[PDB]
Design a protein around this motif. Structure first.
Motif, short mmCIF file in Angstrom:
data_model
loop_
_atom_site.label_atom_id
_atom_site.label_comp_id
_atom_site.label_asym_id
_atom_site.label_seq_id
_atom_site.Cartn_x
_atom_site.Cartn_y
_atom_site.Cartn_z
N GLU A 125 0.82 -1.21 0.00
CA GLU A 125 0.00 0.00 0.00
C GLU A 125 0.85 1.26 0.00
OE1 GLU A 125 -2.58 -0.67 3.32
OE2 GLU A 125 -4.16 -1.55 2.08
N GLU A 156 -1.49 13.33 -7.27
CA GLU A 156 -2.88 13.02 -6.95
C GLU A 156 -3.14 12.97 -5.44
OE1 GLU A 156 -4.51 9.89 -9.42
OE2 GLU A 156 -5.65 9.04 -7.75
N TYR A 157 -2.10 13.06 -4.62
CA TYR A 157 -2.26 12.97 -3.17
C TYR A 157 -2.42 14.36 -2.57
CZ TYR A 157 -1.21 12.26 1.76
OH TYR A 157 -1.26 12.26 3.13
N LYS A 158 -3.53 14.58 -1.88
CA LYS A 158 -3.77 15.80 -1.11
C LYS A 158 -4.01 15.42 0.34
CE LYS A 158 -3.32 17.25 -5.06
NZ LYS A 158 -2.01 17.81 -5.49
N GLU A 198 -7.67 14.64 2.51
CA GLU A 198 -8.79 14.27 1.67
C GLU A 198 -9.23 12.82 1.89
OE1 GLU A 198 -7.89 12.27 -2.65
OE2 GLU A 198 -8.29 14.43 -2.56
N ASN A 199 -8.31 11.95 2.30
CA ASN A 199 -8.58 10.52 2.43
C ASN A 199 -7.84 10.01 3.65
OD1 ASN A 199 -8.24 7.52 1.97
ND2 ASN A 199 -9.54 8.03 0.22
N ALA A 200 -8.59 9.63 4.69
CA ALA A 200 -7.97 9.26 5.96
C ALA A 200 -7.11 8.00 5.83
CB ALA A 200 -9.04 9.06 7.03
N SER A 201 -7.49 7.08 4.94
CA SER A 201 -6.69 5.88 4.74
C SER A 201 -5.32 6.23 4.18
CB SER A 201 -7.41 4.90 3.80
OG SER A 201 -8.75 4.69 4.22
N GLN A 202 -5.29 7.05 3.12
CA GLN A 202 -4.02 7.47 2.53
C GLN A 202 -3.18 8.26 3.52
OE1 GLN A 202 -4.99 9.68 -0.97
NE2 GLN A 202 -5.31 7.86 -2.25
N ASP A 203 -3.81 9.02 4.41
CA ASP A 203 -3.06 9.77 5.42
C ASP A 203 -2.40 8.82 6.41
OD1 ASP A 203 -5.49 12.52 5.61
OD2 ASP A 203 -3.98 11.98 4.10
#
Length: 348
Positions: A291, A303-305, A308-313
């Motif tokens: 991941e 594409e990453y901010k 915006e997305n707690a999983s990606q954070d």
């Protein structure tokens, strides 16, 4: 056809003729006997099943790519992906009784640095070095690899936990090809019943753990020129061995040592040499690794901010703790308990 074996070789540098030309350590033991360089592999009923881990002290290997006593492991890399520096770590931080190093067909100044490395190593009194430079003939370059194996086989019969390194299989395959041409054998087509090219699998089924003796854990280096190029020779030896470490040119340029890409590396005996708790953490660590790199391509795409997305954070904030677990100073070795306590902290 016959070579020196015994505890008297410990600390010695032997040339492709099987006799000692230099010494990086001196030992009280003077036992020197004689055994044939060509020995039959153990019958399947003499081999024991690989059940015990061979710890290397390298965090990424011991946690995700755990080796076993008797296993044969390929190490795939191009020059220079620190394959020589990984082997120095494998020798320093493992716990073998005896180490046997075989430098095949290498330049020549390479042989003197390995000896210089062994001269200052803590394992010097438990090491034997077989070398064949570029000046030696192709016949001699081959014999360096079977002399190195024969030396390792004597120590296994005596009960020792032996570690065998042949660097490289690549230059061994090239020198062997030269020997085949003297007999008329071409790489494409061949001779029968004995082909000079089948020298390779014969040599690689000799390691292993014996029911009646010790074990030979073998590491064969294969040179991946260029940039993880799939050499034809590279795919056969992946077919024969029990796993392969792959040293990634990409992870090297970013400053991560060892440049092992665990997602492209495997040990086939992994689940047979670790308990269930280990398997659970390693499985969870490999999904965290996968991941992360999914997120790195998202980042490279712009594409990453954040937020915006707690999983990606959550994945993003794990990159630092994952990279620090993977990194390792070559002077440092980790016990199995420290490796497993660190990997768990990375996953929590």
């Amino acid at each position: 056809l016959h070579t020196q074996v015994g505890r008297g070789l410990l600390g010695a540098v032997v040339n492709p003729l099987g006799e000692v030309t230099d010494k990086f350590a001196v030992t009280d033991n003077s036992e020197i006997l004689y055994r044939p360089v060509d020995n039959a592999p153990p019958l399947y009923s003499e081999r024991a099943a690989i059940e015990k881990p061979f710890l290397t002290g390298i965090k990424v290997i011991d946690s995700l790519l755990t080796c076993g006593e008797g296993q044969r492991m390929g190490i795939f890399a191009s020059a220079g992906c620190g394959k020589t520096f990984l082997m120095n770590m494998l020798i320093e931080h493992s716990g073998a009784d005896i180490y046997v190093i075989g430098l095949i067909g290498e330049r020549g100044a390479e042989v003197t640095e390995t000896v210089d490395y062994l001269k200052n190593s803590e394992k010097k009194s438990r090491c034997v070095l077989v070398y064949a430079t570029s000046d030696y003939s192709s016949v001699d370059r081959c014999n360096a690899a079977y002399i190195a194996t024969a030396i390792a086989e004597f120590f296994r019969t005596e009960g020792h936990k032996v570690a065998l390194f042949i660097d490289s299989l690549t230059r061994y395959a090239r020198a062997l090809r030269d020997v085949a041409l003297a007999a008329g054998e071409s790489p494409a087509r061949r001779g029968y019943p004995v082909s000079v090219f089948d020298s390779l699998p014969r040599l690689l089924e000799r390691p292993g753990k014996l029911k009646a003796g010790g074990s030979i854990t073998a590491f064969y280096t294969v040179l991946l020129e260029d940039d993880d190029f799939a050499d034809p020779l590279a795919e056969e030896v992946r077919s024969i061995l029990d796993g392969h470490i792959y040293l990634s040119r990409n992870l090297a340029q970013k400053g991560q040592f060892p440049a092992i890409d665990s997602l492209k590396s495997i040990s086939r005996v992994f689940t047979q040499v670790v308990d269930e708790k280990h398997r659970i953490m390693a499985a969870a660590f490999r999904e965290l690794l996968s991941e992360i790199e999914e997120l790195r391509t998202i980042i490279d795409f712009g594409e990453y901010k954040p937020g915006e997305n707690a999983s990606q954070d959550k994945i993003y904030n794990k990159i630092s703790v994952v990279e620090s677990f993977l990194k390792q100073d070559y002077r440092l070795g980790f016990t199995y308990e420290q490796t497993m306590e660190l990997i768990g902290e990375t996953i929590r």
